[PDB]
């Protein structure tokens, strides 16, 4: 798009012939694409020839622009002749008897937030950090570390994108990024590294109750695709993929001291984030879709997790 550093070279500028409404007539047309959506065509001398990532697996639908992915809460309800029981007995371990129980015909409002490596906007544990796993003796089992207090995350795409519409055949419009207004700069997320560090102390202390006297070591995800190795969102309608390697770092001993002094400090840990538009949703090839771009710039204030360790 303007050569230079991977902050700008994240965007290719690509052109193609496209079919107008008039079946015999093709028009030359152009768009910007994020590098992961694009793959180099073979059978050429390492040239400027490319294709979309999905043409050799499945034709993805563009998501209709009226459709909104926002996590509006769902209540589940029991049919007639059934009842939903729930625990009032909080700080529950996830199996065995609850001492304080209620019926409800409908659940509280649950948000269908889909993500990885963290949850977001989840309801908090009642009085303390709670650690749940189906069998801690087996490393195959996840450890759901349910938090007591909301650490805040701020995420943004600070490029000022313009949307353009490409007319394809009769009565259809593909949508693509036409231009970036003014400055480049990088998509990223910010967490107050003070509150995060305290939270990794407090998870240290509770996780040590199941692993007594041991020092606790956090680390980055081991490896794989972006979908495995990055945290993920849909802020506004963009499928961010953020590298968490600097976040799950350091090792913390049984001392678990309040190293964050009571005085003011402004240390923010920052995550740099890729973006994609063609997504093979929920590891499905036929589930795949193209998200249309969103004009302007994005900000996305949020409360974090019960960690998926």
């Amino acid at each position, epitope marked *: 798009a*303007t050569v*230079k*550093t991977g*902050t*700008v070279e994240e965007m290719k500028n690509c052109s193609f012939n496209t079919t107008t409404e008039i079946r015999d007539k093709e028009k030359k047309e152009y768009a910007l694409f994020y590098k992961p959506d694009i793959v180099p065509l073979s059978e050429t001398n390492n040239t400027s020839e490319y294709r979309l990532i999905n043409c050799n697996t499945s034709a993805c639908t563009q998501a209709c622009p009226k459709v909104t992915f926002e996590p509006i809460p769902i209540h589940y309800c029991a049919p007639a002749g059934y009842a939903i029981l729930k625990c009032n007995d909080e700080t529950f371990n996830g199996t065995g008897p609850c001492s304080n129980v209620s019926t409800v015909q409908c659940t509280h409002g649950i948000r269908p937030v889909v993500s990885t490596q963290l949850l977001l906007n989840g309801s908090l544990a009642e009085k303390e950090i709670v650690i749940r796993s189906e069998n801690l003796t087996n490393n195959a089992k996840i450890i759901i570390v349910h938090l007591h207090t909301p650490v805040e995350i701020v995420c943004t795409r*600070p490029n000022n994108n313009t949307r353009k519409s490409v007319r394809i055949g009769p009565g259809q419009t593909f949508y693509a990024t036409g231009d970036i207004i*003014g*400055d*480049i*700069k*990088q998509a*990223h997320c910010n967490i107050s590294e003070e509150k995060w560090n305290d939270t990794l102390q407090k998870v240290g202390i509770e996780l040590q109750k199941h692993f007594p006297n041991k020092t606790i070591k956090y680390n980055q995800s081991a490896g794989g695709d972006m979908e495995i190795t990055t945290h993920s969102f849909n802020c506004g309608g963009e499928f961010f993929y953020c590298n968490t390697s600097n976040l799950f770092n350091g090792t913390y001993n049984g001392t678990y001291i309040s190293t964050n002094s009571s005085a003011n400090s402004t240390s923010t840990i*920052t995550l740099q984030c890729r973006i994609k538009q063609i997504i093979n949703m929920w590891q499905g090839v036929g589930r795949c879709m193209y998200a249309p771009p969103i004009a302007g710039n994005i900000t996305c204030r949020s409360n974090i997790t019960g960690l998926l360790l």
Partner: antibody
Amino acid sequence: EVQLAESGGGLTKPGGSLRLSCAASGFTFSDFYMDWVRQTPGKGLEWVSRINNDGRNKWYADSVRGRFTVSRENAKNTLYLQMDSLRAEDTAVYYCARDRPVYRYWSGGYHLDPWGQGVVVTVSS
Amino acid sequence: YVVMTQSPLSLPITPGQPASISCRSSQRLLHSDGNTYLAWYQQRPGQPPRRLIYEVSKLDSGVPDRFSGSGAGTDFTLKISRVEAEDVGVYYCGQNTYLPYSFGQGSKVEIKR
């Protein structure tokens, strides 16, 4: 540090062409807008042109629009102004000055700070 | 467009005395981003301009503390708590809020004798 060095100054006939080179030292030259500003005994100060950090967007004053073009080579820490169709009034002292920063995550307000020591251009042969 | 204008031309003023200069734009210097982008430049005899006061009123790095400033909307001032021999030369206001960036016609500080 942050030091700017203008160079390339000379004499020409009216209607002719000259090129000015500003070389940048002790700052990250990829990360600034850059401006040309010029001085005469009549006017005091006049803005000439602005260029984006990646070289993409460019702006000029009404007095030189289309006649001059501005350019940069971030591989050299270097800015160039190409001047063509030089009028008698373009006879001035030309300065290079550093404008708006564009860091990784954010990009603040407009400036002309610091300034190089300038170069001389004469348009009457 | 933004026209600029400074009120005092010559300042024939004794070393040690306060002085001030006022500059008054044709249109308000407030930018959409919510800062106001005036600055004040000193040119000594035989030198390029350098910037003393900027973002209305902040001192730029290395500037002597005797310089200071104020203002709002279109109207802004540079104040010197005590003028000195090294203050001699021409002062310009300038705006950067709108293209073209534009400059006052100047004011000259001079030793009184």
